[PDB]
Amino acid sequence: AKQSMKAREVKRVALADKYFAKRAELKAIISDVNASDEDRWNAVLKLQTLPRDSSPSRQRNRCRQTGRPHGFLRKFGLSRIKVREAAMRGEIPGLKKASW
Amino acid sequence: RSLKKGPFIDLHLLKKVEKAVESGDKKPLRTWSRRSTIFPNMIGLTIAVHNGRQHVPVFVTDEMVGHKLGEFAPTRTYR
Amino acid sequence: RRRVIGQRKILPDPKFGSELLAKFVNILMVDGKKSTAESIVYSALETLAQRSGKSELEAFEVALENVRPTVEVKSRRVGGSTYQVPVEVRPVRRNALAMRWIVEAARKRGDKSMALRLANELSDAAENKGTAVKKREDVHRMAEANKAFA
Amino acid sequence: GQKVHPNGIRLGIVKPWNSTWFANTKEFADNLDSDFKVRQYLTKELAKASVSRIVIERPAKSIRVTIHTARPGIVIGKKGEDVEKLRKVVADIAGVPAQINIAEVRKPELDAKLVADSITSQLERRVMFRRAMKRAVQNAMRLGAKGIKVEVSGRLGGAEIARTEWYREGRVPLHTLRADIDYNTSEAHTTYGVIGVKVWIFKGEI
Amino acid sequence: RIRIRLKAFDHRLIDQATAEIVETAKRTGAQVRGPIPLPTRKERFTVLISPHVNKDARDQYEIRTHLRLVDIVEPTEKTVDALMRLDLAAGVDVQISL
RNA sequence: ACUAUGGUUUUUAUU
RNA sequence: GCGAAGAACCUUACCUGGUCUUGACAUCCACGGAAGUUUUCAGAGAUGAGAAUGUGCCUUCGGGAACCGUGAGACAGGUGCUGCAUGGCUGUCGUCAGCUCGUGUUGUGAAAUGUUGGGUUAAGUCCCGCAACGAGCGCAACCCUUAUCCUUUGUUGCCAGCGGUCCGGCCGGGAACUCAAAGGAGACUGCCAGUGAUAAACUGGAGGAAGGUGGGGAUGACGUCAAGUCAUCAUGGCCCUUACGACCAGGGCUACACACGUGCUACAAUGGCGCAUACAAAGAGAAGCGACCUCGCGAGAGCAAGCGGACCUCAUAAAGUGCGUCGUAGUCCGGAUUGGAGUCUGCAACUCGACUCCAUGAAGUCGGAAUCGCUAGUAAUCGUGGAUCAGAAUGCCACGGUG
Q1: Are E26 and E86 in contact (CB under 8 A)?
Q2: What is the distance between the alpha carbons of residues C8 and C23, in angstroms, rounded to a whole number?
Q3: Is residue A5 part of a domain?
Q4: Would A100 be classed as within a structural domain?
Q5: A91 and D12: CB-CB below 8 Å?
Q6: Is the CB atom of residue D163 positioned under 7 angstroms from any atom of strand F?
Q7: How far apart are CA B39 and CA D159, in angstroms?
Q8: Can you give the C-alpha Rg of chain D in angstroms?
Q9: Nucleic strand F within 7 A of Cβ D161
């Protein structure tokens, strides 16, 4: 897990509040480029491209012990091998092998 | 699909052809990227685009049939 | 080295009562679907009426007796030694081989429906003039290479 | 051998566990971040309470814990029916109100963790250690048990040689499934060399 | 009308929790005697045996998820307090609803 | 019913 | 289809140029500002320079501090080089029957005995024999699971028996039969007849739903080899640190001079096409699944009920069954080309996006050499879910129909 990718994940939460909240109603009216074919708000059209890293692109939920996009269960945040460790400790609730 | 059909303008060129009467006569301006399309207002201004290690000089004429800036700038060094 | 069977239960024909007439369907079928083979059996007996059909009240059990596989060669040793000798195929296998020998010839006629193709090849086998035999002619030569065995 | 772990890969059967924590199924992946935040100031308080085993208990948005100690007079004094002096610490380091419990201990020297602490005291000090190993074997085998492993690795010189040794007693099945082997890991660096101490005790099957 | 949500990952622990809330209901007047068990669910999970380069070979783990709602026709001066103060049991999620 | 090859150098016991 | 469930930027190794640094990440010291919000110019941007507004937490206002912006040391960053350093985890045989111990015995000794020898098995399993004997770990047990007959329950699930009947499991009403959550019984080589040191240990027949560890999982001894990996992670030695570091914008792993596994589809009439027509499991969902109803050739859009998920939502499974119709025509079957427009998403559809609608129709008659799977609900075969997911599969993992 990379400290620059962990620090970017925090910056994304604080920018989703900034560029991805209360802008969707404006985005619905500024994104039309055929209804009159006239240019009169170009600065506001280039505002929809201001966010580059804080929108649903790049954002992945990842394995919460390695930062890795692979081999994990999002219902626990644990990998397909650390689930064996935690199930052998009773540390994932009710998850068992035999003993039923 | 695309905007607006056909080749569409970019602000980073639209400004440089409006400043062409304020900055006057000079050696070619760098614009880096090769993605933009050409438009009939690009006449009388010389520009340069990145080739992958340096920049190469480009000029637009009425003898063009519509193009991207990459069609003036090859990036490969064999064939 | 351990089996020893286990012959497995099979369902004989509901209208003719025969195991051999149900066994034919297991070889006539395509992609395990079986239902179209169950529509070609006996439907190929109404077409066979006009031709050399053998025992109509036995459907195909007597017409299959006109198809004559008898011997098998290659993949064998005798006396612990490599030998090119023929062997006689088991009686419970000979007719199940004759079933493939006739449906593999019949479906590869260049004309009409299977119900007609099969009625032609069963009439022409009853005079020994049938199709699709050259594919096994070099095996029949190898079976005739030896009459003195070991 | 030697990597089959009694308190790792063999812990998912017949053994008591040291941690259980409850959370919303849709935020267990978010609460996983807290599992060190509850330890970071408490792990170095366990020896200060003479604790032989901890059981971390965490209800939804809460904390409890149970601790097993032979010497509760070290952390609560007399008479043991008021645990306030420990509760006020556990609730402050956790950032949430807490209700902790204290349990008793039977045959405390018949324990792989005490045997490991009794041997590590020699090697973290670069002194004679085999006396403590033989004393631990003749302590455990005369207090209970049917076999024991006590193993040491590194700085066993002889000046700057490393080496590894154990000398076993009785019988100790480490590959049998339901053997219930009491175990502890110890690992350290003195800033001049690495050391390790490995302990396994066998008492009875199932 | 109100409902008391009981959720568990085991078919015996949900019946122990049902006996624990009925034992408490009989000790706050009357409120629960024999509720309905509802339909059940399962979730199946796989884990890897070797930490690298083998994901074909897996081992299987299971949870059996239960839900009970109890359902109440009239709460009392003891239902809204003494039955809410109940600590119940470990391994079970308890909520009041509506 | 069937055949000859390989120079020289060459790593675990512990952070 | 493997490290690496979906690599346009990002990811990232590699490669160009900007922009920022004792470092965004861990702690400590000198100095300033509330973080933040509002806005203009420079730049595509990372950032740079101006102009206002707030005064939180903390606080007798003291200066502290989350945080923001400049300084300086110990130290940070680096999927940088290397698995002949040092951990950790490791391939495959294989659930395979093997690997070992103490005290005696034997040889000059390394070594041997037992564990070999003789029958038997899935078996170091059990009898026989015995200067070697009894033991340990692995095994077998243990644990999970299935057809049948019972048993608990009795629901919005089921309807034998009985009452009524929009003539229906529908409604009465019922726990019969399925069934849902679970617990039992049955099988003992018992019985017949064979086999064999008539031993140990096996094999047919009868009955039974099923029999000779009933089957199948889940159980991983001794281990094999300078075993794999500096690319999950740890980390010495060595290097970069006004950066090879993080951040931006360009690109590269599809440039094409030379080229290949693995896997799939047609080669028919047992079809191709338009209708009629029969039967599912596994599951899955609140900034969610999204209905009713209209519109859009369609992908979708308007829109927002019901359900916190057995009286709501995803979702009419296809192969199969039967008419009509073309016809042995390189095929009225089959599939490369080819030219544009729609739908969804995204800095971005230059370029190797997906979904959607057309016209042209090269190749193809089961394919040289060499060669793979499976003993039965197995092999083969046609569809449907689940996971990944801003937009992106026929792959990965499951399940049903036929067999």
Answers
A1: no
A2: 13
A3: yes
A4: no
A5: no
A6: yes
A7: 82
A8: 19
A9: yes
Q: Quote the tokens at residue C73.
A: 């060669």
Nucleotide nearest to E39 (CA to C1'): G310
Specify if A11 maps to a domain: yes
Provide the token pair at D113: 């963790």
Distance D206 CA to G126 C1' (A): 28
Q: Cα dihedral sign for C43, C48, C54, C56?
A: positive
Structure tokens at C72: 């098998």
Instruction: To the nearest 10°, report the CA torsion of A17, A21, A23, A25.
Output: 180
Number of domains in chain A: 1
Domain that holds residue A34: 1-90
Elucidation technique: cryo-EM
Cis peptide before C4 (omega within 30 of 0): yes
**Run of H or E residues at D175:** none
Euclidean distance between CA atoms D48 and D85, whole angstroms? 13
Instruction: Please indicate, yes or no, if residue A58 is contained in any of the structural domains.
Output: yes
Cα–Cα distance measured from residue D122 to residue D133, given in angstroms and rounded to the nearest whole number: 10
Instruction: Enter the resolution in angstroms.
Output: 17.0
- If you measure CA to C1', which residue is closest to nucleotide G10? A58
CA torsion through residues D127, D133, D136, D142, sign: negative
With contact defined as beta carbons under 8 Å apart, do A81 and A68 qualify? Answer: no
Residues 6+ apart with CB under 8 A from B4: A33, A34, A37
Best probe of the A interface among D18, D28, D58, D206, by most A CBs < 10 A, is D28
Please answer yes or no on whether A78 and D11 come within 8 Å at the CB atom: no
Strands (E), D16-174: 19-21, 51-58, 66-69, 101-103, 147-153, 164-165, 169-170
Q: Is E61 on the interface with A (CB under 8 A)?
A: yes
Residue closest to C50 by CA, chosen among C115, C130, C119, C114: C119
D194 CA: nearest nucleotide by C1': F15
